[PDB]
Each structure stands twice: as C-alpha cells, then as structure tokens.
Amino acid sequence: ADIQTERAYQKQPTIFQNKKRVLLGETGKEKLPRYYKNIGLGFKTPKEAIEGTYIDKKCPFTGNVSIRGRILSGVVTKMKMQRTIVIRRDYLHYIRKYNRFEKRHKNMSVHLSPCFRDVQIGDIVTVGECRPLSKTVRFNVLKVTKAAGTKKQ
Amino acid sequence: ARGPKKHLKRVAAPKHWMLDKLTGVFAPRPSTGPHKLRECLPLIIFLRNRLKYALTGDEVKKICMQRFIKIDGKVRTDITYPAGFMDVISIDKTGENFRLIYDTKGRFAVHRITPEEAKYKLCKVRKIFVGTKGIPHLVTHDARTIRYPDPLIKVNDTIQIDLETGKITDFIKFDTGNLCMVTGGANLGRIGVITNRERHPGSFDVVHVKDANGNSFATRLSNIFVIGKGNKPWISLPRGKGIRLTIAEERDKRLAAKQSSG
Amino acid sequence: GISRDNWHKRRKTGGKRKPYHKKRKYELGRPAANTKIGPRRIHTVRVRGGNKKYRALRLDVGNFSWGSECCTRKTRIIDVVYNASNNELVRTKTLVKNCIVLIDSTPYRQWYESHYALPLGRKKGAKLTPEEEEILNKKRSKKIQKKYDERKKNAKISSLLEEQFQQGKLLACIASRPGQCGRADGYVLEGKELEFYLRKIKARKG
RNA sequence: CGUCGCUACUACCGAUUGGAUGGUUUAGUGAGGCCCUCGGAUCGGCCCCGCCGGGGUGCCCUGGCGGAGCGCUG
RNA sequence: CGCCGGGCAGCUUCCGGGAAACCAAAGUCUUUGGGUUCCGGGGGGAGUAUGGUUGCAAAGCUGAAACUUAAAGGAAUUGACGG
RNA sequence: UAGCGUAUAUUAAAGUUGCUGCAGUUAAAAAGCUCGUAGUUGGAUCUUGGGAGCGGGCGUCCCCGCCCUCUCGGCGGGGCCCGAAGCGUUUACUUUGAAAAAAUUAGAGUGUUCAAAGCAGGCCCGAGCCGCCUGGAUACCGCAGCUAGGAAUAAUGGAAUAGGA
RNA sequence: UACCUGGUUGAUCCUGCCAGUAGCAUAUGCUUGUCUCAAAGAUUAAGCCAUGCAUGUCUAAGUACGCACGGCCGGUACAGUGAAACUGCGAAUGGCUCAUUAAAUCAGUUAUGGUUCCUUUGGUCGCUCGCCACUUGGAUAACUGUGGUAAUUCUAGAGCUAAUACAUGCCGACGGGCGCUGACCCCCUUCGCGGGGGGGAUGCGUGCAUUUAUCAGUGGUGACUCUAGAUAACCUCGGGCCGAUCGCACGCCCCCCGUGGCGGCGACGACCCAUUCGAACGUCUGCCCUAUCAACUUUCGAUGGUAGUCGCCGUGCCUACCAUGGUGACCACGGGUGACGGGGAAUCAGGGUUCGAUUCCGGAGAGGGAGCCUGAGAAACGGCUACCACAUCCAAGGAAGGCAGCA
RNA sequence: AAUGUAGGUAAGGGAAGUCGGCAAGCCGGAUCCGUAACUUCGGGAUAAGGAUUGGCUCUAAGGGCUGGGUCGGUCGCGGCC
Ligand SMILES: [Mg+2]
Ligand SMILES: [Mg+2]
Ligand SMILES: [Mg+2]
Ligand SMILES: [Mg+2]
Ligand SMILES: [Mg+2]
Ligand SMILES: [Mg+2]
Ligand SMILES: [Mg+2]
Ligand SMILES: [Mg+2]
Ligand SMILES: [Mg+2]
Ligand SMILES: [Mg+2]
Ligand SMILES: [Mg+2]
Ligand SMILES: [Mg+2]
Ligand SMILES: [Mg+2]
Ligand SMILES: [Mg+2]
Ligand SMILES: [Mg+2]
Ligand SMILES: [Mg+2]
Ligand SMILES: [Mg+2]
Ligand SMILES: [Mg+2]
Ligand SMILES: [Mg+2]
Ligand SMILES: [Mg+2]
C-alpha cells in the first residue's frame, strides 16, 4: 500500500524533501532519506524501521517518542486496533495469610510500530514506557519474539 | 494545598537536625537556598543547638542581625538560611571558622578549621552545559554556576572554589581510586576510596567504595562527593576520619573512655 | 468553566468514574481562537505562571519560507483552500496550524529576479520597463556577470510552482499555531506534498 | 402429635393505578460569570488659527480670551 | 491342585483409628501438608417469605430475616415397660 | 483497692471459620450419576567423582584453591596485566547491597528523687575552670520496583520437511 | 503463661452451643486524700448560630508641605519623630472537620527527553551601531470644603499634591566588526579574447527572548526533533529585555584651568538561565462486603488512527474524518459501606482477628451546587457573582450574611 | 326578523351539565430517542412520555460506461508478428 492514505500529507517532520532538484541531481531516481535513531538501552533498531517507507509519529525508531522509565514485557492478545495491540501480563500475587499465591493478570494497550510486520497472537513483546500516546496507551513495543514458532507447516 | 507550604512540624523535621519533641510544635523551616531542606542545617539550629551561642530564636536573630555570621565569605542575615554541605561558616568577632561536614553517624558535626583552609571550598559539579555565544557553564552541588571552566572538568567531578572570587583553582576528576564521601543514604558520612562503578543505563549508577579499614560498601552515584586526590583529602576530616564503626566496638570505646576519665 | 480533566471520562473498562473533587483552576480550558482573515486583531490572555498567550482573532499577513530557495518573506494571506481536519474551517476561512492557504508570491518573485535575474511569473515582458530593464542588464562588470551566469544554471523552478507564480498566488502550509502565538508563519508547499494537496483540492472540486 | 377455641408477640400476602423521605437522571425553562461580534454615555491629543500677538526680522519664537478643525485621532 | 491380574464380597486380627457402635478402611492425624471437587457451623422459624430462573401443570434450582429457644441431638450402660 | 460494679463494640478463650489447624457412615454435613471448560495439580531423565597449599585440625576435618569468551590488557606491535563488548534461554526461588520521613514498636546509653517519661547529661572548680568530656545509637519496615552472588527445586525454550551449529 | 470451668443424662462417653473468664474503649453508677503525665462535641446533626477575637505589615535605604509634635539657628527644597494615605508584600500558610470518595484517594517505585514555578541563592544586565538626558508627561490618594441615605468597612461633586504607582523616552558604550549588495580601481597567464586574486565608494540587516523554514555537525545523555553554531526572515499598540529609582560615609583629577570629569559600600530592580520550595498529570504493584449484581462501554467518546482546537505541557481534553474497537468467572459492570488513605492501635505461642474521625504525611470541604477577579500559586469562601435552603436589620425604598477557626 | 337546518368562534372556570362526557373538542404525518404491568412469550406497542420539522446557501456519502501499451524492427501518416 501507499503511505498517503490520510487527509493530510504524512511525512517525517525532520527530513526535508524538496532539496532543490537541479542538474547535478540525477533525477531520477533519488531515494528519499529516512530519519531513524537508536533508542538506547541495548535495543537494536530493526532493518524495516531503517529502510521502510511507513510514517508513524509514535514509532520508537522513526517517530517523536523517547523511551524512558520501565521496560517490561507481555504476551500479544489481540491485534484489532490501528497501529496498536493489547497484551496480557501474568503475575502471581502473594497472600500472606495462606502463604500462597494468586494468579492475576492485567491487560495493557501498547503501540505497535509498523516495523514489526510478523507479529502474531501469543508472541512475547518487550515494551518500554513512553509519554501518554492515547487515553490508555503508555508503552511502545521495542522487541518481538516468537512463541515456539519460526516455521509454518 | 492551594500553594506552597511555609511551615515545618517539629516531628516532621529532618532527623539529623537532632531536634527534640517537647520544646515546640514547629521546626525552623529553612528558607529556599543553595541546598535542599532535607540535607541543610539552618543557622538558627546551628547557632542555638550545635554551639549554644543562643538560647532562643530571638537571640540567634540578634546575633544574625548584628552581621557577625559570614557564610562562604558573605554576610547572611537570614535566621533560617540553609547552610548545607561544606559551606564555610565564619565568625570574625569570636575568630573561628566552621566547616559543615557530616560525621560517621550522618549528622552535621561542629568542625573547626583554620582561616587559611577556610579560604577555599570544595564543590561537586552537577551539570555542564554550553550556553549562548558558545560559553561553557558549570553548575555545582550548590546553586552556584560559573562560566569558562576548565574543559577537562566533566560531570560529577570536584572543583576547588576559592572564596571572595568564586573561581576554580583546581579540580579532582571522578576516577577509580579517589577519596570520596557519601552525602546521602544509609552510608551518609563514610570516607573511603572509589573502588568500582557499575553503571545501569536508564537508571542509577552504583559505586562501590572501600574505606581505610577495609569495610567495603556501595551507594548511588548521586550521593558521592569526591574529596581527595587518590587518598589524601583536600579538606580537614572530622574526628573519626569518617570511619563508621559498629556499636559492638563503640560500646567498648565508651567503656574505655569511662575507665580513663574515672 | 471548560475543563480539561481526565476524571470526567469513563474508565478504560467502561465503568463510570465519580469525581473526588470539584473543578480546579489548573485544569481549565478556554474558548477557541477561531482565527479569521482580515485586519490584524490580537488579544492577550494571561496564562498559568503569569505568562502571556496571543489569541490572533484575525490575521492577514504571515511569514512564509520557500525552503528549497531558503527565501523567507512576510507576505499576505489571501484565503484558505484546504484543511485536513474540517471542511467547515475552509468554508469559514479559519486559520489553524495545518490548514493550507494562498499567499502572495510578490516578495518571492522579487527575490527571484534580484538573485537569479530570470523572468518569473511574467507572460510577455516589457510591462515594468523603469525597473525590469534595469534588473535584467545592470550593465555589470565581468566578475559580477561571472557570478550571475554561474547562478543561472541551477535556476530551475518546478512547473507547478511556475504555474502558481504565473497565477500570482502560491499555496503554502501554516506551521505556527494562531491562538497560541498570535502569528501565521509557514512554509511554501512544493514537491510531492504540493502534488498531493493539488490532487486533494481538484478531487474536492472539479 | 395435629386440628379447633381464647390471649399475647413477630414477621408475610393484600385492593388501595397506597403514602412519605432520599438519591440519580431525560426533557423544558433558565440566573450568573467568562469569551466573541457590536456598541459608544463620557474623558483626552493634534488639525489650534475669529485675534490681538510677533523675532531670528505682511515673513509669529509664543506668552492668553476666543470661536471651534465641526476633521484626524486615543 | 496351584500361580498372576482386575472385580463382588466374606471370616479373622491389640495394624491402626474412633465418642462408641464399628471400620483393613471410617488406617497410615497434635509424630497434624499426595492432588483435587462439593459441602457443615446449637435447636427451631425454614427449605419458609421475597426476588430470579426452569416447567403445560404439579413443581424443580437458587434462597433470607424478624422472632424464639438451653438445649436439641449421637453411641453405648443399667433399670422399667412391650397387645 | 483509690478504685470497683454495670451496659455495649471488639480481641483472646474459638482447633466453635481451622493456611498453620476443624469436620462431613450414625451427631449438622459427599451433589442421583457421568462427561466437561475455566481453576488447581501434574511421573522418571541432562555434572559425578577424581585435585594441590594455605585447609569448618593431605592433617585421607577440610577456612578452602575449583585441578565464559574476546578486546586498546593503561603497569600497528614486550612477559612487567587487568579494561571497552556479549552471555552458549527467559523466569520463579534464596542470599547480599542500595533506596526506603519522623513519631510510635523493639532496643543501646542516661539515678526523672523511682517509674510512666524525657533526650538529656557527666568531670573537676583547690575560685578564676578567664572551661573540659560526651550522647542524641541500632534493629524492623510486608508486597511491588532496583543491584550483585548461587543454581538444588519448579516452569519455559534450542537441531526433525533441518529453514541446524 | 501455647490454660480452661458450669449446663442436655438415672448415670457414662461425645457433638455442640449457652454461660462463665481476661484485656481495651465508649458510656454510666458508687466512691475518691497526695502527686507526675494526659484524651476531651468524632460516633446522632458536614445541623443551626447571638457576641467577642482569630491577618496584617516599615528599614538609613519607594512617596510626608497632617502641626500631631519638634531641633530651627534665622533666611533654609527636604533636621528629626511621625498619624493618615498611595505603593510593595502577605492574606493560596496555619487551624478545623471527615460529608463525598472503592484503582478513586493513598502507600512504596519510577518518569516529566511531556510542564510551570513567587521568593532565596548564583549567573546575566556598554555584547544591539539606531532643542529634556544635569532627569520627560498627566492623573489620583491622604488633605480642605459642600452633601445624600434610616442603615454598611456606602460614597458623589468640587479644589490641591507626590512616586520604585501610572505612562513616555533619549544620550553613552560607538571606534568599528560581520554578512549580503556591490560603483569602480589595482596587480595579474597577459595576448588578439578569456583571466586568478586584492581592494573597495554607495546601499540593507546585525544582541538576548519569540515564531517559522533551511544547512552543518562546541559540549551531553542509554536514548533528542538536546545544547551550542550558520542562513532567510518575523517579532503581536490590551505590543518582551536593553534601569528617568532610594540611602551611607565622603574623597581624587585638575593641564584644559576654576566647573566639570571621576569615584567606594549598599538597597531596590530586571528579559532570560540555573538552583531551592514545590506543584500537576503520568508508570508498576497493592483495598472491605455483595452474583437475590453476568455481561458492561459505545447515537450524547466508548477503544484506537490522522489532522487540528484548547491547556503550562503528554493524552478523546475537545472537534472533524475514519476504524470497531475496549473490559469481563484471574469477578468486569452494578450496588453497599455505620469507608477519607497511610504511618499506626488493641489482642498476643506461631499464624491471625478487629480498630485507625483523632495532633505526622497525603486528599477533600467550608450550608448545597455552580461561575469567576486578582495573583507565581485559589475554581479561595475570616474574596466576589448568581440560584436554592435558612436567616439579620428596615423609616418597607433598600441593605447585610456563612464558627467543619478560638471560646 | 324570530325559530330552525349545516358550519365556526368565545374571556375566566373546566363535566359543576346530563341517566350517561351525548355532542363537540383534544391527539394526529414523518425523523430521533424512549416505552410499564401483564402475557398463551407471539404480543401489549403508534404503550405511556419527550425533542425536531420552514426558507436559503453549501458540504459529504451512496453509481454506470469507455480506454490503460514498450515500440516505423515499417507501407496493409495505417494494418499481421
Ligand atoms: Mg485431591
Ligand atoms: Mg444451625
Ligand atoms: Mg474473642
Ligand atoms: Mg466443630
Ligand atoms: Mg445427619
Ligand atoms: Mg480442565
Ligand atoms: Mg517432575
Ligand atoms: Mg463517611
Ligand atoms: Mg485517618
Ligand atoms: Mg491532615
Ligand atoms: Mg477547597
Ligand atoms: Mg504576587
Ligand atoms: Mg467556593
Ligand atoms: Mg371558554
Ligand atoms: Mg380559556
Ligand atoms: Mg354530575
Ligand atoms: Mg345535576
Ligand atoms: Mg363522541
Ligand atoms: Mg394499554
Ligand atoms: Mg433550519
């Protein structure tokens, strides 16, 4: 699909596109430069984020978001929203009186950048805390790992 | 609250102030200044409880208003001025100088110093940024900022600020093997040598320090003030040399003192 | 008054939240500026911390930058032609942060001849003889001609911008926020963005 | 052990489209504040200039009455 | 005539348990923890009232409270009594 | 005993709410029976013993030494050494350290005349002491979050159309 | 101190509850000599309140022509003490109470690289080339005088007078530099052309802050669309800064001369930055009872996307256009609470069970709602406006209220 | 003119008229909400109740037909591979 599906022109604000097409610029074909950054904390930016064409202002690598605070992880539950998914974190809550634990869970809506294309329900996603992206979204998917997959039958 | 608070309850006061319970309901409530109110020593309690020069807040107010209290080379008439860490307190009428340093028990001790040592003061740089016209700047652990420092000075190093000028004479790099002092947390007031620094990106860096006796502890990076080049301090250390000794070897020290005095 | 609180909204689960306090001042909202086009009118509102905000109620000039030519001029805004958010903003000619407008290309043309010495926007010439005759020749020396003829080669303007200059009106996108800063700065649309907005306008009408 | 008969007490059903007091809301009306577009009771400046005046010499340096320029303006 | 496995049981036993009757399970429990489900909290009021739900109906499931009461019960022993 | 009675809420008694730790044939109690999803719980199995000297005394006790790789070793080219990078899973667990307001709790010191308390105080003064010595500790602070050791137990993965190292 | 006893029977072992027993915490009854601490209108009524007080403030260093006093030392702007008043600051803290409030408040943790911040402290304040400066203008207080009303901390008219109030506005640094524009000129390969550079007359902008757009990559983070540079321009008449301020001792230069220029210590002040006090919304985990509450949310924002508006800022906070999502037996949603949360308190083998209105921290509220002005900070109530409920005075025309502050 | 027959209006009250609301009156279409007891579970139901409705100037959304060639390597300014 083409990236211009919105009413406004989708573009990366940092990159200037109209760099004075002149004789010394052999047009065509000049590829548009891509803005990207490493997000720190040892996470490597994916090659799809490096050399894709998608526009996402909330992408951790090609958007205006900084990853700071808590780095945690979850399991993909549903992928029904636009550019964002819901994940389930499973934890054990300790009840002192019975010296036993209690299986609990919480659902978190996290933003999924288009640089992660092969994301399926059940995968393990490492997410990082960012500024509030929506009413219920405060985390970005920084890493995706398959759940006993890496092959299709 | 609809605005800032300007009262401090007596029991909610910082523990290291050593204020009792029955004397009042309120605490000094130090004014805003170079140091946070959690780790500052206001002049009212410094001159009323640590030195006993004053019996009341009115008496310490009289002493302050007669302009005898010089802090860092400047006369301060504020009764509740937050003194803070290693600011030189100078009284020229009685002719002594004080350096405000934590003891082994994490409390500000009455440390007396010579005038020639009091003429200088150590500071821990808290940030280094370049401002307009490309002018480097330097903000210390006080609110003190200076322009045009040595470019070799990096973040959380120590600088020697000579008073009455405010300029830099020398500096100590934060390096492994340098004498430091813990300025916060449980190990508050312990003198030792920087032995290791583990750094956690996105979080607090933890530095491991071994003292003279070999008791190795650790603390967060923000709670460290380098005070010497390698092992020789650049200031006068208080009694006990910042060597925290446990209650087991404190009790027999007390007993030996009682035996010697009796 | 108008409140920007989060507690009046339903919970993520859909449950209804009950407020634990009345409306506070710091969570206030103010009526929209709704900047129109006309003689300059700017009101001042005091904001949190005693600082200042400018409600541009009406504006007619704006500082727009070419970008490709790096020429930035204070020109006149004629009207609004497209708005991504609402069509009603175009109809009421409301200047907002991302609406695209028609601006006078006279200063950009003046810079173009004063810098490159090429007829931009002209049809047949010989219509401004006391000025254009000077600005074409200048009877300048060998070195100055060596500067100008060297600058000739990269004096190429896209055909879309050329058509706009012939019409006398460029179309440019605002970048500032009127009603927050009180001004209507922006940048001249050109390139793929220009083609995208041209196609949007033509699909809207015609 | 149960019915029946008498006396207490406690609840239940029950016509009465029962009654009372709270709470939450639809709708209608809607004070007041704030914002926007007008509005202009008044208060000022310049153009004052019916004039005596006037000095570098009818050509005013202006020291006041005065009409009012019946405009430009805040 | 024997052996093995899975059953329905029986006799016997100071294994042990239990208030005992009895039970090789109702044992391996103050020397208390193999996994897990349901479920009781003095007797009545009461499986009642009300609400919900199922049913053609009869009724089934879920299910109180006010109030009342010092016992109601279990197993055994001795006696009395037995159409 | 200058205090004692009564009413009421609550705690212990109550192993009569039972996680520790109750019961369910007959006392009140296991669904008529079976299947069955959530929930809970899940068999065995992958490193053990051989080493040297300090050694819970090889004193055949054993403080204990154990007989990961690769990058400039900061004492473009030395053995005189220790720093830049990753962990040949991810966790739970355990230990350590940091950071965790004070008061209260425990608890160190201190003859408040004793004590509940308080955070004070004590030494000489021969009278000149034109003043000396101190204290205002320490512990705990669940759960969650952070850091560094251990790897038994428990879960979870790696190479099977090899799309493996 | 890891504890039991009486009561079902003719009698016995049990189950089982009833009663006894001990503590603390409210009330109450009786009694009460000393002394040291010490809770105290929370429970019902966050019900209603007379009266009185509870927030005002001046240094040498903003403005004194009050006679209200007073040195005069006597020919003088102002000695000095100073009421009143303007100005500045504070009144947003403290104190009270616990009604609301069930992932809400709150506790621990963490972030603001997503914000603002009075004051204090430290930077910065000749960085800008641009007919009063030996100091500009008007008004108003206090004050005199004339009144109105029954009333109030109500005020009108008239006449004066000041500023660190309110406005206006230079000089100085200042000599220039820099970047574009470049008249022309000179040296040049010289040669018949091109030439490679040097100057430069005349013009236009130069500093910090703001708002855009573009380029390059002095310091810093784990990670900037950071900081600092360079360019093109902006820079809002309800419009940023670039001192028309006040005390204290008083001295230096005198060629030019002879009245001018220099001076120290402060105070006040500032655009901006830092710091301090914070504040605000965020991240993770954690709360009692209830299913005779099992499906909720979503037209009228519910979950997300894009672009905006608004806000101090991030965000459905709101709007437009799209998508159809989001939460639930791991208890959603609804309801109850005689629920403010926590630090903590009672009881005490261990484990627990109850209680925390109450002096510390945090939150909320000021009869019930709601809306605002000022200010850095309030949706303030010992501030205002309106409605409702109570309620005071009244000459009936009006006027004035808020004890969950101390009594 | 009366009285009638058919049709209207009427202040304030609102069935007090009458055997009796007889007669008249009220309501009424459409759109958006929202709808109870009871029930043979189909209904009740247009329940009840409330809001909107003109003119003018626009803005969106909901369709159908055709054609998309890389070319003279060529002659049936055009045709086969
Ligand atoms: Mg089991
Ligand atoms: Mg029972
Ligand atoms: Mg009890
Ligand atoms: Mg029992
Ligand atoms: Mg039974
Ligand atoms: Mg199952
Ligand atoms: Mg196993
Ligand atoms: Mg309550
Ligand atoms: Mg409380
Ligand atoms: Mg409080
Ligand atoms: Mg309030
Ligand atoms: Mg203020
Ligand atoms: Mg209020
Ligand atoms: Mg009528
Ligand atoms: Mg009528
Ligand atoms: Mg009748
Ligand atoms: Mg009648
Ligand atoms: Mg009819
Ligand atoms: Mg009906
Ligand atoms: Mg209409």
PDB file of N, CA, C and O (backbone and C1' of nucleotides) and ligand atoms in Angstrom, chain H residues 11-14, ligand 15:
ATOM      1  P     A H  11     -62.051  31.693  25.691  1.00  0.00           P
ATOM      2  O5'   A H  11     -61.347  32.718  26.681  1.00  0.00           O
ATOM      3  C5'   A H  11     -60.799  33.939  26.209  1.00  0.00           C
ATOM      4  C4'   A H  11     -61.010  35.046  27.208  1.00  0.00           C
ATOM      5  C3'   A H  11     -60.908  34.628  28.665  1.00  0.00           C
ATOM      6  O3'   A H  11     -59.573  34.695  29.130  1.00  0.00           O
ATOM      7  C1'   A H  11     -62.871  35.922  28.320  1.00  0.00           C
ATOM      8  P     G H  12     -58.786  33.369  29.555  1.00  0.00           P
ATOM      9  O5'   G H  12     -59.386  33.025  30.984  1.00  0.00           O
ATOM     10  C5'   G H  12     -59.276  33.948  32.052  1.00  0.00           C
ATOM     11  C4'   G H  12     -60.185  33.578  33.190  1.00  0.00           C
ATOM     12  C3'   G H  12     -60.354  32.096  33.447  1.00  0.00           C
ATOM     13  O3'   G H  12     -59.278  31.540  34.172  1.00  0.00           O
ATOM     14  C1'   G H  12     -62.460  33.148  33.492  1.00  0.00           C
ATOM     15  P     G H  13     -58.813  30.035  33.883  1.00  0.00           P
ATOM     16  O5'   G H  13     -59.989  29.156  34.485  1.00  0.00           O
ATOM     17  C5'   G H  13     -60.286  29.193  35.869  1.00  0.00           C
ATOM     18  C4'   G H  13     -61.600  28.520  36.161  1.00  0.00           C
ATOM     19  C3'   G H  13     -61.705  27.064  35.766  1.00  0.00           C
ATOM     20  O3'   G H  13     -61.100  26.206  36.712  1.00  0.00           O
ATOM     21  C1'   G H  13     -63.680  28.220  35.160  1.00  0.00           C
ATOM     22  P     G H  14     -60.049  25.096  36.240  1.00  0.00           P
ATOM     23  O5'   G H  14     -60.956  23.871  35.805  1.00  0.00           O
ATOM     24  C5'   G H  14     -62.166  23.566  36.487  1.00  0.00           C
ATOM     25  C4'   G H  14     -63.163  22.907  35.569  1.00  0.00           C
ATOM     26  C3'   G H  14     -62.694  21.596  34.951  1.00  0.00           C
ATOM     27  O3'   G H  14     -63.810  20.732  34.772  1.00  0.00           O
ATOM     28  C1'   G H  14     -63.174  23.134  33.241  1.00  0.00           C
TER      29        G H  14
HETATM   30 MG    MG I  15     -59.694  29.612  28.340  1.00  0.00          MG
END
